[PDB]
């Protein structure tokens, strides 16, 4: 559960501890439903001690032990999760060939392919509900201190009741074909700081979630499809952003833009995203106002106010002092603007460089708070 110790960096141990070894005789492989990286994927039935329908991921013959470890490690990770919007693991087969990962059956398959199949056949409210489910799954993952690093519509599965669940777990996931090498990551879904500095956090997952929102509201359009990967690199590094989908509520596109904030600290947390989507869903009239859709627009020009002290500290990469600011009562912004350099020093900022950085930032923050701009 959340808060308990996790095993995200030891695949074999996670397989031993958090997966159920299933006897091959209890598995019935039926039709082929897809092709994974490590082998074919089948639909089948599993007998437990009544038969239940399941998805069966197999490991190709002639595999290397490294591929076997990476394959079963996904199940080792999946077995630690229990949530409505996270793909559920039934078990594994590691003792006998072929290696198998057995999960719940998701009849409608990948979300992007599903939405392209059902182009325009859902209401806006239903799409928002799909996004809310994905966001709830991601909130659970963030609360489990698990960074997905590869959140995308193609990695969201849909069952016969249209429940959307996050899938695709593991560690060294350079395997996906969309990722391309740089400085191997799916650049069209990856936050700027994660492409430049490989800083993968839940905030970069929030960026990816904004991209997923775009994918859902467009019914599976490829992000930046007009642009090459190099042009996408320039676009994201310079502040260009995707335009609004057609028939997209203004609040949803604004949420997208919030997920795409250049500074990761300003992006909302997944808990905030779930709450926001819940509020929109309970008052569906809030979804009637649409963002201006221009079919000729393919990309938005770069865009040109802190709520928490932690947001401002992470802005200047001084988050390591955040706890020290709260513990001394400096919990508001209009209270940190009333700080002297000695107050900064006593709460535990000793390095002169950090003192200088914080002081220079406080000057600009005082400028911000005292700004007046009221149109007459
Ligand atoms: N639980 C499930 N229910 C129904 N179909 C499933 C399924 N799991 C996988 N599939 C099908 O198999 C396809 C690929 O599966 P999967 O994504 O797990 O392989 P993979 O993770 O190795 C690709 P990548 O490495 O690029 O992320 C999916 O597109 C999907 O159609
Ligand atoms: Mg996978």
Residue numbers in the entry: 587 to 635, 639 to 772, 778 to 898, 905 to 976
What does the publication say?
The Eph receptors are the largest receptor tyrosine kinase family, and together with their cell surface-anchored ephrin ligands represent an important cell-cell communication system that regulates a multitude of physiological and pathological processes. The intracellular portion of the Eph receptors includes a juxtamembrane segment, the tyrosine kinase domain, a linker, a sterile alpha motif (SAM) domain, and a short C-terminal tail containing a PDZ domain-binding motif. EphA2 promotes cancer malignancy through a poorly understood non-canonical form of signaling involving serine/threonine phosphorylation of the linker connecting its kinase and SAM domains. The kinase-SAM linker contains a cluster of five serine/threonine residues that besides S897 include S892, T898, S899 and S901.
To determine whether the negative charges introduced by phosphorylation of the linker might affect the kinase-SAM domain arrangement, we solved the structures of two EphA2 phosphomimetic mutants. In the second EphA2 mutant, we replaced only S901 with glutamic acid. The EphA2 S901E structure is essentially identical to the WT structure, in agreement with the lack of definition of residue S901 in the structures and suggesting that S901 phosphorylation alone does not significantly affect the conformation of the EphA2 intracellular region.
